[PDB]
Symmetry: D3
Subunit: 259 residues, 6 copies
């Protein structure tokens, strides 16, 4: 039967719940998981990259901050088509990975957030026309999912009519982009992915912590302050640079170790 052309970009928010786990998790990612993953999807994924997170900022924990990385894929077909379940070689995936990332507690576990999007941002709300010449960006990529039972249209209205205007009013914020999550692909609980750029951490803080104190607490709030959503369950995020050396289809040459 036919396979549908379905160009998409996806983001996975990869936490590391203890610094003691960092060397093991990073080793699995770069030594074991890159080659397994390239082996599977090289013919139908056009780009596969990791964007290591900047140091977690003050209060970043309340935003479900991914302390390892954002993992990004660009797909030509849906990876959730049931025909793609079959693989000659399955990935080497120890249970420990789920512990390191926080899906399994070693107090409450966190879901694994794997959000599919169109390849192009749907909404350009601030900073259209910004070029790389204009300077280094502190790119705060945030996904949110309204609580079960909350009308999606109500939440959309809050996000674009109450939240985004505070971003627009802050000169510290240089860029605001958004897309709806493709819920039809894999059941992801998130509803929106936004990327919100600052010059630096102080600017992120000024706007996302201090300026947002102006917002009323919504009746569905899951925490007392913005983003008003349960960390790691209904909000995940990461702050990343413009560039990553881990453009894995182009740049990987095996696990070469330091002398």
């Amino acid at each position: 039967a036919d396979f549908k052309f379905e160009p998409m970009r996806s983001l996975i928010y990869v936490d590391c719940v203890s610094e003691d786990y960092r060397p093991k998790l990073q080793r699995w990612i770069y030594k074991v998981h890159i080659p397994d993953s390239i082996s599977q999807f090289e013919p139908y994924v056009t780009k596969y990259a990791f964007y290591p997170s900047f140091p977690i900022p003050p209060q970043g924990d309340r935003f479900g901050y991914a302390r390892m990385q954002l993992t990004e894929h660009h797909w030509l077909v849906s990876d959730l088509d049931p025909r793609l379940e079959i693989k000659a070689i399955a990935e080497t995936f120890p249970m420990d990975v789920l512990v390191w990332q926080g899906q399994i507690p070693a107090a409450e576990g966190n879901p694994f957030i794997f959000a599919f999007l169109p390849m192009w941002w749907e909404k350009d709300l601030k900073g259209k026309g910004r070029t790389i010449e204009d300077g280094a960006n502190y790119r705060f990529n945030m996904t949110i999912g309204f609580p079960e039972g909350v009308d999606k249209a109500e939440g959309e209205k809050w996000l674009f009519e109450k939240v985004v205007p505070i971003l627009q009013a802050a000169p510290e914020c240089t860029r605001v982009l958004a897309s709806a999550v493709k819920k039809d692909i894999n059941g992801c609980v998130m509803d929106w992915v936004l990327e919100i750029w600052f010059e630096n951490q102080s600017g992120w803080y000024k706007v996302m912590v201090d300026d947002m104190k102006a917002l009323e607490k919504p009746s569905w709030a899951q925490q007392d302050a913005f983003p008003f959503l349960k960390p790691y369950h209904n909000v995940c995020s990461a702050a990343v640079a413009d560039y990553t050396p881990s453009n894995n289809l182009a740049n990987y040459r095996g696990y070469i170790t330091m002398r």
Copy 2:
């Protein structure tokens, strides 16, 4: 004037009928054929690779064993769409290649077997969940086409009800995958491609030669023992390693000669 998205994996079974032809055939493949091919299909083939065959095992001749390599393409469009017949630069093809591969005797000819498949295996019959951590595989890839006149459903039933249970019972066999050949693309006479993994040549032989002696000779048989098909005409195969260095779109740097 639309072009259909038609993601496919194809396999060509490349023999070398005499050791005296090996240097010439290998030279044409790596020095001439790679650059011509990449020149033509770089924009719509996402992977192009050669898997050199392991040394022919005992009785491998009876299985249409490809003594040079399996050639693998992953396509985004059908190469058989008539619009793709037009090429700025046509491939440099000495017709001696056909002598070297055995399509032309220098003895009747053997056909050129080029089988199109979906990119993902259709049936996972044994070893689901095996990872590269489980060990090196001796991967026996075999394509079969039932003789003219044999009902294809009764061939399918023999294959899955008599042959595959013998693989399932053998501990030497670690993996069985299969896909129906896309006969609609190019007229290929083959009906199935299977891949059957062992630890080694001895395991391959214990199962595919000794255990298969329990099978009854079908009425349509073209040889006396399994696979009961005419070698190189109705069955072709190769045993290959998990890995090849000949991943041509990523790894080719021109024909560099030994000093």
Copy 3:
């Protein structure tokens, strides 16, 4: 919210209107524009290449000869879909580029010609079967657009019944290929792209200047001799080699400067 699978090859005719602009234009292209472009379209462009123009041949100015290069993209999706207008990082594009290329004058400016085509030539009009072994080609790529008010079918008929037979008849011409421009993509004013191969510049001249003197001047002619179309507005062209080192998705490593 589906994206259509629309594989296409596009060509941009990049002039350099004074030699004093060459170092600046070339620097912008290779230092600034390559990384901007790759950043944008890596997940949906399978090939991106520059073919530097051979030295402008005698009377080449009358063919809208692009004195810098042909820029070539192979797309999987239409870049003119309005959803693709949104980009996180906009290309660094100084106004000076348009002066250097000749869109912005100083006497008259020239349009920016960006012609979309199918990935495979539609008409193979001479030289089918030619291989790279047959020798080095002087590849003259020319796009034409009939003037405003001229009936397109009447231009087509002139092109294929009067112009092409002269090319076909000349032993100096080794290859003729043509496609209709996909005018529905971006409104490009051109109607056809042809590629016409010679051994060298002398052969080009013999045919495209001397043999073409046999044509009657059409009633819509915008200049006295073939191509009878206004240079850079209704005709653009470049002569290029079979090979380019600038296959940018595979070969670019940053702007490494000479020692």
Copy 4:
């Protein structure tokens, strides 16, 4: 005249003194500096790589911890030969980089290209402003000189938290007596600790560029907790030397007489093989 074959490995300890500087410094390193550097030395440097530092561990500030990265080169000739001062294209090197790294304090007009009589990049790499931290650039032989613990360890043995530390004894301290202290008092503590899986050391080639450091050591643990147990708690058993410039081990002035970084076994920034220009996220 001839050029001497002089194979060496060098290490530069790159700090980032405020998180607000991080995006700017990182951009300069990866977008501007890599291409300038590769352009200059491609013909005589066989490896050029960056090892980004793990998050600064508790009390890492006392060890001159580099909050950005370790920069590593493998040379075939000495970069400090005076004939190598001449370069067709000099590095684009604003004074801001020294501010971001902590070599100099923040100031007006630091977007300006560095000024020196000779090469800007070479001069920046000798920075020693009394109000900042010196620029530490240590040359070594390509092979570790002393293997003091964990010989035979393979990559199959597991992920390492590799703590690379360089030390330089203070002005007036006899080098031979610092050496003896290092190898007879310090190193036995590392050997005794089950948490330390490797100890390697080389003498700094001071003759190359006047680097004030004397030794580079690399000391491996499983993780930050192991590093802390050994390098902070276990070292409390040491007597404070008469020359100490701080109260606890390393007893040396942070960022002036000791620099360090903890890094992973692998880096994706193997720049002569892996760099493809400054591709930006979509």
Copy 5:
């Protein structure tokens, strides 16, 4: 404490003694060993490549035919300098690899890491076990010393069947006498045969690592039949030397005093340039 500039080409003759071992040995080589090796010597080896052996020709066993590959390095310094024994990460080298290649007989617990006083990889590469075949690692200059037939041959002249053979004369045989036999009796048979298109030779650098071999020759043919016609049938003309260890040419004990491989002009496994990790078939 200087390191000498010592440009060299080395060849290792890699056998596979049973077809059942091939998938395991090939996996170790390509999945495990490449990255360990590149990690160790990237800064001072300018090329590292594998040339898989063509199928063993008839009577190839008598020439110590390597059934897996030739491994080739181009070195800038001697790997045998004792300072190069020290390695941050040692090679993952199970004893099994020695069984698969035929250095040692099969035995219990050969999945263990090689046990050595010094570096395991270096020890492995000196394997010289009485019940197996020695590990043959021959160092050469980068340029062939003697060009004896086919000077001026280009790649346009056609595909070569390149037979690379190393020989070492037995215990007690004068080296000058063996040299004289090689060049005055053996080589003129190659020169007369039109099936032989190329003859090249170099003296083994015996001083680097104690290699028992004395010469490396490379001898080209069009194909296996040409090889056999010359190296088997034409060589029957030679008289059997008094030192002979087998009845026919090469008159040397297979795998101990002669190793060989027939290889193609090109390899995809130019590892410093072409390796991208162990990507597995779908």
Copy 6:
């Protein structure tokens, strides 16, 4: 015997004497010659690159302007050591290449491989036919010896029109006298011109291969108009030397005692890193 460590940069001035030859010469260089060359010297050449020439400026013919490219190598050992004459595979090198480049006049049977008693490529590269132009292959140190103008210029300062010129004084002229004219009369005119942003020079290493040239200079401008203003108009102030072989600067015989090219700062043809075979346009 040992090989001397001899790091050098070499330049070859590649002309194309007729536009009709351009497709053929260009094909040979990129399709045939790159792989033959990389095959030979990958282990001891650290960089191999082609810089295509900008279009020949007005009066460029009087400067021996290379209408194809500059070919650049960075060597670790001398290519002219006699031991390097031996090569397993010689370059595919038809006489026609010498026609295309202007080393020899056009003639029958020039598709023939070059015939030499030693290596054909090395012999091609010593071409010096009385009816053509010699083959100019100049060896230099890897670092410019003299920095005479524009020290400290970065790539941020803008695009360069880089005019690389080599000169050799005629038979009989005292080399010290030529040197003094170059540096006391010619260079000051470059230093004085505001259009000139950079002047670098090195002495040709004449001991390597007997190159006739004595100096290589690189002289930068903004563009072709700047080049002409300085190198044609400003140079009219110079007195004609008594050894002049043409009436105006450079006063040397085009293509025999002066060769040159104007090139950009960047080339895509960094051949050891960037070459992936001869992929043809669709």
